[PDB]
Amino acid sequence: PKEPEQLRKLFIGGLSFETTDESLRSHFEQWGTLTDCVVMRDPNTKRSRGFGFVTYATVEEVDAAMNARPHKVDGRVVEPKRAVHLTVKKIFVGGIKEDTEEHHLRDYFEQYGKIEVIEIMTDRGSGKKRGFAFVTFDDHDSVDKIVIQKYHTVNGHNCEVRKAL
Ligand SMILES: Cn1cc(C(N)=O)c(C(F)F)n1
Structure with a gap:
């Protein structure tokens, strides 16, 4: 069966405000099948909140995307992280x-x-x-x-x- 969806998601911070669901998808589909891909926006203005998320079909696809960092999406280097963030090395x-x-x-x-x-x-x-x-x-x-x-x-x-x- 499928890995839990939470483990297949990547939170993408630092987006260009011009990035859309479609451009985020076109970028991240290079590393796997995306079952979901969303840019977060303000509910009133529709202006991007500067972050979003993508969900891959498998954990190995998440790994492939992370191994392909740095990701420059629509001209800006973004910050992908697996879903919960206490970011330490x-x-x-x-x-x-x-x-x-x-x-x-x-x-x-x-x-x-x-x-x-x-x-x-x-x-x-x-x-x-x-x-x-x-x-x-x-x-x-x-x-x-x-x-x-x-x-x-x-x-x-x-x-x-x-x-x-
Ligand atoms: C300076 N710095 C680099 C990293 C990293 N690449 O993983 C982090 C951590 F917070 F995420 N800090």
Whole structure:
């Protein structure tokens, strides 16, 4: 069956006020089938609110659109984000215990995005591993993909992953 619609939507901020449902659709249809595409407008003036949303038929199409950023739509670089926004580039990874190392976290998380920092947390007094880590990516979409998954398995551990700061 189909992925939930919420996970197939992209909120597009920073639109040109000249962008229309039709021009937004013509642009974003390059990366997949769009089941919905709307520019938000003022109810009285019909002047654009400068943002809108598109709904793809599949999550893989959302991924393709995000991987094709930056998007210049009607002459303006826009800001697409997956639907709920707390936009951050860093995650907390908990439940990794004492045997999880940098390469375990890198080999898994590098498939969500480009990693800039991996910080495996150690005890200030003893140096022993505390069983959690932070991963910083170059871009927020990695984190957005990560936190919507129900499960993360790293080094055989069932991990708790959340947005950090
Ligand atoms: C400066 N900066 C870059 C990003 C990004 N590419 O994802 C963010 C975050 F807020 F979305 N901040």
